[PDB]
Design a protein around this ligand. Structure first.
Ligand SMILES: CCCCCCCCCO[C@@H]1O[C@H](CO)[C@@H](O)[C@H](O)[C@H]1O
Length: 410
């Protein structure tokens, strides 16, 4: 009935957001590629994806999911717009703040949008719901890159540091400014889009949800919800699973190009980037089919299946070499696909009141994407080769598979 149109609205809204945000992701390098400095950027990620979750979750429970969605969408656009002035007058701090603000908007929507979808109807199809909505997101990112990337990088000044270095100061001065005069258009478009969404949300009326309910005296408490969460094993485990996923995922993609160039003579860093784009096509295709699988079958089985397959690809990747290992690596994304969503739904469904704080944590495990890199680099260096470092992902996939035969409750 009324649980359905909002859903579809949301998928389309997942799509658009993934486009809009993905565009932000394409522009930032340039805006930053203008010039302790960049360590501060990477932390904006830890900030948005580690801090905000819980507070964002506090917001959710004392208000609603939609609040979080709305406020989250607000944070992002605020941070984004901060660029126009930060750009034009070349204040990095103004840039940095807008960044951090955007960062919180993401952690916000993340802890917010995901449970909202899985809960946006019957518990059983909560998993499929989120997956479909992700596929829409993923498709959005496809679009984002495909169309927008090329058809928006023809306004960006190509410049060999060769020239850039030789420029006089006033020239260099001038150059930089033309760059920001480029971002200040699709950036308005981006912001525009963010607002269009926020609007649509504010307008569309959603049905009532149990996990929303503020109905709770003292037991509604954070620490209350917290200790309650502790007793839950599959939630506990899903958290462990999601730390491992992000870990493994970023490990694959992160060192994929390095792998290519080190493994195949004579691979160019430029060319390997194709195997990378391929991986994204795998990912999306992976998700599409994967979700259709979640229609017919138990999520954990589809999860466990995909978990195992992915781990297998990695061992082939780690142990083989040449293209065989590379192709396995890129083919792996086809199976990471379904994982983030499913780990998430399986993780919460069925949490009730504790759904919201349940997410806040799940999301924080995105800290894993950063934590693997040193491990990846570490193992890699000890190994002498990238491939054997690919064992780390495989190791995550193994763990995630256990969770899939250990995901249950009652
Ligand atoms: C109308 C409300 C929309 C709220 C959206 C929050 C959903 C979070 C989904 O993350 C996005 O989805 C894709 C796959 O995860 C990524 O490719 C994209 O870069 C990422 O940002």
């Amino acid at each position: 009935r009324s649980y359905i149109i909002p859903f579809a609205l949301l998928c389309s809204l997942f799509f658009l957001w993934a486009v809009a945000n993905n565009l932000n992701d394409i522009l930032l390098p340039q805006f930053q590629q203008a010039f302790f400095q960049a360590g501060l950027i990477q932390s904006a990620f830890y900030f948005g994806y580690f801090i905000i979750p819980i507070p964002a979750g506090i917001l959710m429970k004392k208000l609603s999911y939609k609040a979080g969605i709305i406020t989250g969408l607000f944070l992002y656009a605020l941070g984004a717009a901060l660029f126009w002035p930060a750009a034009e007058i070349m204040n990095y701090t103004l840039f940095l703040v807008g960044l951090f603000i955007i960062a919180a908007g993401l952690g916000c929507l993340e802890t917010a949008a995901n449970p909202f979808v899985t809960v946006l109807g019957p518990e059983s199809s909560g998993h499929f719901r989120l997956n479909l909505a992700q596929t829409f997101a993923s498709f959005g990112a496809i679009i984002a890159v495909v169309f927008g990337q090329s058809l928006i990088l023809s306004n960006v000044p190509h410049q060999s540091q060769d020239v850039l270095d030789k420029m006089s100061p006033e020239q260099l001065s001038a150059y930089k400014h033309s760059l920001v005069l480029s971002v200040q258009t699709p950036y308005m478009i981006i912001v525009a889009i963010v607002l269009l969404v926020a609007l649509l949300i504010m307008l569309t009326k959603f049905p009532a949800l149990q996990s929303d309910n503020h109905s709770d005296a003292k037991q509604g408490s954070f620490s209350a919800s917290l200790s309650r969460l502790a007793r839950i094993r599959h939630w506990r485990w899903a958290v462990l699973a999601q730390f491992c996923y992000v870990g493994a995922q970023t490990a694959c993609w992160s060192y994929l190009i390095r792998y290519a160039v080190e493994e195949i003579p004579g691979m160019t860093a430029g060319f390997a980037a194709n195997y990378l784009t391929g991986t994204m096509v795998c990912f999306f295709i992976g998700r599409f089919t994967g979700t259709w699988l979640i229609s017919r079958f138990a999520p954990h089985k589809v999860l466990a299946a995909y978990a195992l397959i992915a781990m297998a690809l990695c061992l082939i990747s780690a142990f083989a070499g040449g293209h065989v290992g590379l192709i396995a690596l890129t083919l792996c994304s086809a199976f990471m696909s379904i994982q983030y969503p499913t780990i998430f739904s399986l993780g919460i469904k069925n949490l009730g009141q504790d759904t919201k704080y349940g997410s806040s944590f799940i999301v924080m495990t995105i800290i894993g994407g950063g934590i693997v890199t040193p491990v990846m680099g570490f193992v890699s260096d000890a190994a002498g080769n990238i491939p054997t470092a690919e064992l780390i992902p495989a190791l995550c996939f193994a763990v995630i598979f256990i969770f899939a035969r250990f995901r249950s409750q009652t």
